[PDB]
Ligand binder design. Sequence first.
Ligand code: AGS
Ligand code: MG
Lengths: 54, 53, 212, 41
Amino acid sequence: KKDYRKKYRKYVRSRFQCIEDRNARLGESVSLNKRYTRLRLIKEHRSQQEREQE
Amino acid sequence: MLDWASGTLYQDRFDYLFYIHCREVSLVTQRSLGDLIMSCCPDPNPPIHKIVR
Amino acid sequence: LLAIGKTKTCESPVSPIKMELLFDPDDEHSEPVHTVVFQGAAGIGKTILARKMMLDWASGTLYQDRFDYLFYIHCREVSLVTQRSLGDLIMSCCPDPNPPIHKIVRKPSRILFLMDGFDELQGAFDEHIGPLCTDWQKAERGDILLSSLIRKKLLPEASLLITTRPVALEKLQHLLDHPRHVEILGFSEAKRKEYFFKYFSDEAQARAAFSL
Amino acid sequence: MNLFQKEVDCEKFYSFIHMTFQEFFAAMYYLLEELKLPSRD
Ligand SMILES: Nc1ncnc2c1ncn2[C@@H]1O[C@H](COP(=O)(O)OP(=O)(O)OP(O)(O)=S)[C@@H](O)[C@H]1O
Ligand SMILES: [Mg+2]
């Protein structure tokens, strides 16, 4: 017994929880759950006239 | 990646989301899928003959 | 700069940071930090603070849990040309013909790698050494092993702590894994008049010594 | 090397440990014996 899934999940959750900005002096990371909004995703159907008008 | 790790999406389906940045991965030397899975898997040896099974 | 030069004697209390929970996660349900960076002026207390942490841990006054192998590693002493392997770097700070490494390093979740004087090697980091070992039983080349340890290739889940003069910052920021750093200041206003009472024998000495 | 971030990126802005220390170093410049810095008069 060794749920390596559990260990890998812990490691990834530890390593992927902070987002350093471009101008981030040492130790100024920000939590993703704080500074992460939700974008817009669409199954692309963008025509030429549609793109130009956009 | 973080949501999966916390268990907020893709609880089933898959459990080994191996992030692989393209810029970091230079393509000349010897990159083997074993090493590409080790890099994003902290251990002296991650079980590959079991992960990739 | 200017005020502290003048007197900086005005009442300016602040909220202090503790030492036992320096590695605890920011919130309460996040992930614990795996790197801290003490930074302060030259000769301000980095090495003495590292020694204090080591001795307090040994006596069992902090970090009773968490980790139990705080391997002090001075930077100046560790020359980087020859063959430094993590096995030897753990033996050096471990008095024995052979310390159990295949057992000590088998739980990198419980370790600390206290370092010191990373300004001793600013010059040393210039070209990104392509070989980044990930094993503790290899001839790791020294400086390459140090860079791998800093980047968390060796024992990637082994906690760390780096003291350093503010002389690199930038070049260092390309190697740290989002580390929570702490700036050191010194004795504030009363810590001085308490330091005199620890350096000098009695009140008869200390009072006049301080007043002078 | 205290680095200050402005706008989008941070710059070096080297500084002395303290103004009195810098003044002492200026005095040492004058005392010690040898673009141009202030005339050693
Ligand atoms: N916690 C402390 N309390 C009282 N005195 C201290 C303390 N820490 C350091 N000192 C004094 O400061 C001296 C050096 O302190 P350190 O912080 O070791 O200097 P240092 O920063 O190691 O020198 P560098 O910058 O690494 S070349 C010691 O010899 C002590 O006398
Ligand atoms: Mg020091």
